[PDB]
Amino acid sequence: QKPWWEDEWEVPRETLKLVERLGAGQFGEVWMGYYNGHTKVAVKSLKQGSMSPDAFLAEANLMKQLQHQRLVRLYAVVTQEPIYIITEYMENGSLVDFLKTPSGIKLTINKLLDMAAQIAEGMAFIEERNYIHRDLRAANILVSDTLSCKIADFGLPIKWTAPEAINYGTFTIKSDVWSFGILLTEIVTHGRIPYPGMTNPEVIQNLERGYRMVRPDNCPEELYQLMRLCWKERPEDRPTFDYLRSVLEDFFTAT
Numbered sequence: 385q386k387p388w389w390e391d392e393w394e395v396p397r398e399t400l401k402l403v404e405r406l407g408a409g410q411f412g413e414v415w416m417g418y419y420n421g422h423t424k425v426a427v428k429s430l431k432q433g434s435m436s437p438d439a440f441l442a443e444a445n446l447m448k449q450l451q452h453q454r455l456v457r458l459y460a461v462v463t464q465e466p467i468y469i470i471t472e473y474m475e476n477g478s479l480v481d482f483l484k485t486p487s488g489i490k491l492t493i494n495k496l497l498d499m500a501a502q503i504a505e506g507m508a509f510i511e512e513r514n515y516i517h518r519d520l521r522a523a524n525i526l527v528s529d530t531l532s533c534k535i536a537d538f539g540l541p542i543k544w545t546a547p548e549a550i551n552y553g554t555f556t557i558k559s560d561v562w563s564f565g566i567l568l569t570e571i572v573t574h575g576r577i578p579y580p581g582m583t584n585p586e587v588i589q590n591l592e593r594g595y596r597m598v599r600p601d602n603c604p605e606e607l608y609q610l611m612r613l614c615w616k617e618r619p620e621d622r623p624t625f626d627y628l629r630s631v632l633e634d635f636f637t638a639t
């Protein structure tokens with residue numbers, strides 16, 4: 385029988401030690417730290433007054449119903465200001481930064497296809513739970529020390545957003561699929577920004593004409609055609625993540 389002013393997932397702040405700022409800003413910060421000394425953790429702290437504690441904590445509640453090996457795992461929370469949200473710590477950071485390290489740069493197309501499927505796997509779970517990511521991109525993907533991936537969302541722009549979402553604010557798992565198509569270009573180009581040298585309005589005009597992003601450099605034609613499916617006009621025509629994972633796995637087992 386815990387006290388009413390504490391969450392079921394509460395832990396005393398004293399069990400945590402914040403060691404390194406991973407990122408800061410708007411509604412608070414993110415720190416790499418330790419739980420009870422031996423366990424590495426990630427900690428999101430709320431900037432007092434930046435937003436409502438309940439609003440902040442709603443994210444964790446959402447993560448409580450979304451536990452899976454391919455998604456960042458919620459560890460606990462501290463519900464007395466400053467409010468914290470604690471999750472597992474992924475050693476290699478964000479996929480976008482990792483792909484540019486001496487290691488990442490050297491990853492083969494086989495390894496990249498692997499990771500792509502992995503992400504597709506996490507999205508399939510998200511899909512089965514009737515959830516909607518809304519911001520699926522390499523910046524929201526975490527890499528572990530064993531080079532495995534996990535979907536995340538750091539609460540942070542056209543280039544990844546599908547037309548109906550941009551134009552009607554209608555986000556669904558289908559718009560996530562479109563965003564995945566784009567994420568796929570980030571993977572194969574080792575982190576390069578999609579639509580090289582194009583502004584947002586340019587991208588917008590191109591998409592309206594029916595043009596899609598130019599084949600990224602060194603991109604397997606088979607991979608490009610899969611991306612094409614993610615970018616179909618009608619949301620209902622884009623594939624499911626299980627299908628995507630299914631194909632990627634085949635490309636991966638053929639390399």
Ligand SMILES: Cc1ccc(C(=O)Nc2cccc(C(F)(F)F)c2)cc1C(=O)Nc1cnc(Nc2ccc(N3CCN(C)CC3)cc2)nc1
Binds near residue numbers: 406
């Ligand atoms: C505290 C927190 C709290 C929540 C989350 C998170 O997803 N939330 C989420 C919310 C809704 C839905 C979902 C989803 F997508 F799962 F469905 C996720 C993430 C964190 C959260 O922030 N977790 C986190 C941060 N960094 C790392 N590792 C990590 C990250 C970056 C870097 N680097 C490399 C070195 N550079 C010097 C700087 C950055 C090094 C390690 N590992 C884990």
